[PDB]
């Protein structure tokens, strides 16, 4: 599809069109501070092309927004290479939000979820988070309408044992939470429940095929999901492989190479040799 930069969208909705053809946002996505927006500015708006965010997803004080089901219906993985505090998902003082509707979100690699102070918000206790996040211990979901024991939640779907009773699991009235059988794990499955290929992440358009993943689990290179970048390719942004040249181009006007990774900075104990971008250990103490 497209890989675009981590964005910061505020005030006017107009800036939001910068995302229209994007499939992966390399970095984070932050949409915030829109005080004059109304329901009807969203009833015609969608980003079905966005499948993955590499860092974190963050929504804060966006008014008139009632569900995300039409905003990001097909976001499937959030990778959490960088986190906002400890969070890979932040839903905060999202006044007007009724329901989440990320019915396609299968996995949040790394981070935790913080969903707080969202009066109006239900369909939260109807989600089994343990099917999306590794560590849910540090989940922080309080002070939503859902905490008032008074929610009209309605969904067919499966029930999990999170509490002292099984609980039907769904996102909206018309979308169940997808659960893959236990041993498929993080790889995803078809509607029947045949496991997708083991190097795929959340979903696949076809079973048993590493070019037909919906979001690579390890690294992406040249169409396929792979275990690792072979040389002469370098690990980038902890999700995709590139050659020396790509990495170099970025650096010149602040990327460097070390451990076969392309990274912003040389790690401690190392200085940057000028001819080759390669971090080398220091001759005596490091001035840095």
């Amino acid at each position, epitope marked *: 599809g497209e890989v675009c930069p981590g964005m910061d969208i505020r005030n006017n909705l107009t800036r939001l069109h910068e995302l229209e053809n994007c499939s992966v946002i390399e970095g984070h996505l932050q949409i915030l501070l829109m005080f004059k927006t109304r329901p009807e500015d969203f009833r015609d708006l969608s980003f079905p092309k966005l499948i993955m965010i590499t860092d974190y997803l963050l929504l804060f004080r966006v008014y008139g927004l009632e569900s995300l089901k039409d905003l990001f219906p097909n976001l499937t993985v959030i990778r959490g290479s960088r986190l906002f505090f400890n969070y890979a998902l932040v839903i905060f003082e999202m006044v007007h939000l009724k329901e989440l509707g990320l019915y396609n979100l299968m996995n949040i690699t790394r981070g935790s979820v913080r969903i707080e102070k969202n009066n109006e918000l239900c369909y939260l206790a109807t989600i089994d988070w343990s099917r999306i996040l590794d560590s849910v211990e540090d989940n922080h979901i309080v002070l939503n309408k859902d905490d008032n024991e008074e929610c009209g939640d309605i969904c067919n779907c499966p029930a999990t044992v999170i509490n002292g009773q099984f609980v039907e699991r769904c996102w909206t009235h018309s979308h169940c939470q997808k659960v893959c059988p236990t041993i498929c794990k993080s790889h995803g499955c078809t509607a029947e429940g045949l496991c997708c290929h083991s*190097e795929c992440l959340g979903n696949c358009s076809q079973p048993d095929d*590493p*070019t037909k993943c919906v979001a690579c689990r390890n*690294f992406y*290179l*040249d*169409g*396929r*999901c*792979v*275990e*690792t*970048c*072979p*040389p002469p390719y370098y*690990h980038f942004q902890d999700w995709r*492989c590139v050659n020396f040249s790509f990495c170099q181009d970025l650096h010149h006007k602040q990327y460097v190479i070390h*451990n*076969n*990774k392309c990274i912003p900075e040389c790690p401690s104990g190392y200085t940057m040799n000028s001819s080759n971008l390669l971090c080398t250990p220091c001759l005596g103490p490091c001035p840095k």
Partner: antibody, heavy 116, light 113 residues
Framework: QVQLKESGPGLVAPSQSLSITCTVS????????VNWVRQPPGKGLEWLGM???????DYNSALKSRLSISKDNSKSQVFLKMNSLQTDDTARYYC????????????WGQGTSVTV | DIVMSQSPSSLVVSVGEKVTMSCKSS????????????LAWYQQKPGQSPKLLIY???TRESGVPDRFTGSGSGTDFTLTISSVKAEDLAVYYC????????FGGGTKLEIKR
């Protein structure tokens, strides 16, 4: 349905060139690499070259410009082209798949006989 | 491209026993970024085209029985066949896939009767 089969001319007189077509099916050539390997009867297996998903090329330095590897991805074909052969080039020629990122050489052709 | 060397040129053994052949490279094959060695083992049952067996020098290919066991790290590698069954007879080769690809001279396995 991963399958490879090589098309050799079989018989080549010295000082003339070798053109082999590896025809693969079941996978996209835009997404995997392909290697060329030969074996003279009862001798070793010899790596000749590979062509990556992006058109990038690797040749054994043994082949001093003698080897050219190119492709037609829309028609699922890989072309090896090798100039001015001698009798020491009498061997069985294979292409084999290369899932570079994840695997090494999975799935081989049955191999085609080439004699100089 | 680097240089690979195997031993022996050929070996013989009878049914039931374990077998270990070796290989060596002119450069270290352990990939830093994931801690895996970029080496392969292939078996070629004779008359047929070879079959992939063991990659990252220890990862077993699906469809390979547990009796096949890969080892070694750095520049020096070994392949092990624990408990020989009848049609285990083949010539085995080592391949590096670190930079380009090159094969070893190979080593032949024969069976006693």
């Amino acid at each position: 349905q991963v399958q490879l089969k090589e098309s050799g001319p079989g018989l080549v007189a010295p000082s003339q060139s070798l053109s082999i077509t590896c025809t693969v099916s079941g996978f996209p050539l835009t997404a995997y690499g392909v290697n060329w390997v030969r074996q003279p009867p009862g001798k070793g297996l010899e790596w000749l070259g590979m062509i990556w998903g992006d058109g990038n090329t690797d040749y054994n330095s043994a082949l001093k410009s003698r080897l050219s590897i190119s492709k037609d991805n829309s028609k699922s074909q890989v072309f090896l082209k090798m100039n001015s052969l001698q009798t020491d080039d009498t061997a069985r020629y294979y292409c084999a798949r290369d899932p570079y990122g994840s695997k090494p050489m999975d799935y081989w052709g049955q191999g085609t006989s080439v004699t100089v | 491209d680097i240089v690979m060397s195997q031993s022996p040129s050929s070996l013989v053994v009878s049914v039931g026993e374990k077998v270990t052949m070796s290989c060596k490279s002119s450069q270290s094959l352990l990939y830093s970024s994931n801690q895996k060695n970029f080496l392969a083992w292939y078996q070629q049952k004779p008359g047929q085209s070879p079959k992939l067996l063991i990659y990252w020098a220890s990862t077993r290919e699906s469809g390979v029985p547990d009796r096949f066991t890969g080892s070694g790290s750095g520049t020096d590698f070994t392949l092990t066949i624990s408990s020989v069954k009848a049609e285990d007879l083949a010539v085995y080769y080592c391949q590096q896939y670190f930079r380009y690809r090159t094969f070893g001279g190979g080593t032949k396995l024969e069976i006693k009767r």
